[PDB]
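In practice, a research group might receive sequence data for several interacting partners and want a quick structural hypothesis before committing to experiments. The following worked case mirrors that situation: the sequences arrive first, and a predicted assembly follows.
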Amino acid sequence: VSPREVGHNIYILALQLSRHNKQLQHLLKPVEDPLAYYENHTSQIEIVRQDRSMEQIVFPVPGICQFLTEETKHRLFTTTEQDEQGSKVSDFFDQSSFLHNEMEWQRKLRSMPLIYWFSRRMTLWGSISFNLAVFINIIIAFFYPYMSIRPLIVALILRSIYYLGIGPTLNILGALNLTNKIVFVVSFVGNRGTFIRGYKAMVMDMEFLYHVGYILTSVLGLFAHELFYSILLFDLIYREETLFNVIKSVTRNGRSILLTALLALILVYLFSIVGFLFLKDDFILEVDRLPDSTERACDTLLMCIVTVMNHGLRNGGGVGDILRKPSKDESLFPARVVYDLLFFFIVIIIVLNLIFGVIIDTFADLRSEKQKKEEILKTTCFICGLERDKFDNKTVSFEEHIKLEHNMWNYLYFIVLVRVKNKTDYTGPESYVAQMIKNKNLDWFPRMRAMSLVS
Amino acid sequence: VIKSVTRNGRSILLTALLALILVYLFSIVGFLFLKDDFILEVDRLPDSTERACDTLLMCIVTVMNHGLRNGGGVGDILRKPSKDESLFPARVVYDLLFFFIVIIIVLNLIFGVIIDTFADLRSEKQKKEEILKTTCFICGLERDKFDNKTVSFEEHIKLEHNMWN
Ligand SMILES: Nc1ncnc2c1ncn2[C@@H]1O[C@H](COP(=O)(O)OP(=O)(O)OP(=O)(O)O)[C@@H](O)[C@H]1O
Ligand SMILES: Nc1ncnc2c1ncn2[C@@H]1O[C@H](COP(=O)(O)OP(=O)(O)OP(=O)(O)O)[C@@H](O)[C@H]1O
Ligand SMILES: [Ca+2]
Ligand SMILES: [Zn+2]
Ligand SMILES: [Zn+2]
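A structural hypothesis for the assembly, expressed as tokens:
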């Protein structure tokens, strides 16, 4: 038995009693301070019983709950998605076991000082890696083939190049990049705790495979050929969230873009068939022969298709740009004019612009989705889903409702308490919530209801 | 109109850095495999062709300067290959890949960002104007609360909740 636990229980009893006594309410207010400690370690939630009645539960916060990370909290709060009924409770509750496993990993990790310290500088390791990769690629670009502190680093690199040489500078930079990427991967695993789910889950994790590929590329740059260092420049997309969104603008409707490209290819095949059938003599292409200056590019259907696809798409005016220039007196001049105008209109003006139109549409779609998600998150309760306008002209404000009454993290703390507490010691509401969790029922989370609003 | 471009200038610059990285990769490939094809015509002030891929730096400069500025891409300036050559399919794939990846997509991301910014500015301006016109500055009540009331919204904002008062 610990006096602190008994004091906390008596404090919870006093808090419950103070609802009907103003003197107790005043005395329990904190001015080291026992009241302040109990107040920072006490939490409260609202639950709905079988009889659709709302009850306020006050419980002490489990000790393991102090190890939850602000990055994990922000990530959950910003990624949790609504369900068909428009409720985030399903996903937020589904992540509870992962949250508890993360708390236990953090508690285990903080006992290992070196590894915790290494895990605390993941951003530093990544920045160092990116800077080394940029410098290596710049040196390669500017010297290949051969034979803030950033200004200081550039000066040291110039001095190393001037004294030792480009090869030795590149070798030192590569070794440093490899050591730093290894430290970064060790820090990444120690922090994210991805092994906690399992070796299968860790392998399935895309970030971990991306880092492993980074490591392999760095090894290849160091040993096989320095030119493999260029691939590391792709880390810019990983590092930048705006560039990633810009690329998403294109990768969200990639199926649409590819179908448009297949449609362009089909129109090119048809135009090549027509040209082979009727304009064979007009496909004369000039050629710079290495040590005649023109060749026929439509003697076979395959080659004609290749010529059209390669040149008409890449020419502003279309296929007609590369074709032999016809004389007005020729009997096929109107046919050629119709051919050229039809290709330029159908393929260049319309089909080639469908890809850019799809990209623009995707841009707008991403903008609208992001705005809607931000609006919902900012102006709606995470748990109950009530809007800010329901709390206007109310004793309790929306901010207090989300800070004290329906705190999702307080609900998580209750779930962890129900998980850690022995079955024999459960109270009424603890047992009800445990039974509901066992039965896979979320009706105990409030929904569009608030005790402060109704009373 | 200039704000339409300067609001997401970071996005434009990141797109340009991405274009530069693709140009660096394409230049590396060309130097490794298409060195002989980088022949550029030159008007010498008082031979008429020069090799523009003898070093990686110069090749990068050539690609960045000409392939971005040419509608058809880098393939426009490269030596024209004969179908009988054993590298003709490689050259075709090179040219189509550069024109598709760099010109069609990457160069259009800047214009797409500009258009998106245009729309964002339009929507923000409309929302701000609507709020200002149809909401009380002080109390924030809308016009629809004053319908069928002795005191109208205009009188509420002119006499009752005057910010200048
Ligand atoms: N149900 C909810 N609806 C909306 N926002 C919520 C909800 N629960 C928590 N938040 C927000 O999530 C963030 C986490 O709140 P939290 O209780 O952790 O406060 P804190 O300021 O980080 O902690 P402390 O001040 O007690 O050290 C805060 O922005 C809080 O407003
Ligand atoms: N709280 C408010 N909400 C909305 N509009 C307001 C508010 N207070 C003032 N305004 C508007 O701001 C402008 C300034 O009003 P102001 O009292 O100065 O009237 P004025 O016509 O300029 O003066 P006067 O007629 O007395 O010489 C007017 O358009 C008024 O409608
Ligand atoms: Ca009991
Ligand atoms: Zn609530
Ligand atoms: Zn008012």
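Before designing any experiment, note the following. Helices of chain B lie at 3-6, 9-33, 56-67, 88-134, 153-160. Residues B 136, 138-139, 141, 156, 161 surround zinc ion (ligand 5) (CB under 6 Å).
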